[PDB]
Design a protein around this ligand. Structure first.
Ligand code: HEM
Length: 152
């Protein structure tokens, strides 16, 4: 678990992401794709995106970006109390999409890195350590729901 203090730090940065979701949304995804392009394969709609510039130009990617952050955000304001919110995503990932936990750690990486580039001064070690934990709590919870559904 995370302390109250840790949670506030997480939500304190979350607040800034919230000022430009679409924008934080696209950076995250561009970073993921770029750093681990094997993840692109889950996306057929994105398959065709050859450059950053085209990636940046897609409404579809930008939307997808917003859809990802809003879900993650609703989960974090739950401060660890997120089974209900969590459950649909674990189902879909265990059943439709088949996303490995590995894919999820990649994404965690892109998240942190974006936050740190955009928000240096609100994203110090304490905060960063706190966001790490929370993203870890999310992946862990996911991982077990997965097993329960027979995936991993
Ligand atoms: C912070 C982590 C993430 C969150 C909150 C998240 C959330 C979502 C949401 C809310 C959807 C739409 C409903 C559903 O199909 O579940 C979605 C769909 C999907 N997610 Fe994720 N996602 C995350 C990470 C990933 C990763 C890392 C991948 C694959 C590498 C991924 C692959 C997919 C795919 C392929 C779909 C189907 C979307 C479509 O084309 O209609 N998600 N994800």
């Amino acid at each position: 678990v995370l302390s109250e203090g840790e949670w506030q730090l997480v939500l304190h940065v979350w607040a800034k992401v919230e000022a430009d979701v679409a924008g934080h949304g696209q950076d995250i995804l561009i970073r993921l794709f770029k750093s681990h392009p094997e993840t692109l394969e889950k996306f057929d709609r994105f398959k065709h995106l050859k450059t950053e510039a085209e990636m940046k130009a897609s409404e579809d990617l930008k939307k997808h970006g917003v859809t990802v952050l809003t879900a993650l955000g609703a989960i974090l304001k739950k401060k660890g109390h997120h089974e209900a919110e969590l459950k649909p995503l674990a189902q879909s990932g265990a059943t439709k999409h088949k996303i490995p936990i590995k894919y999820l750690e990649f994404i965690s990486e892109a998240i942190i890195h974006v936050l740190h580039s955009r928000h240096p001064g609100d994203f110090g070690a304490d905060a960063q350590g706190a966001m790490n934990k929370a993203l870890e709590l999310f992946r862990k919870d996911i991982a077990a729901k997965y097993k329960e559904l027979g995936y991993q």
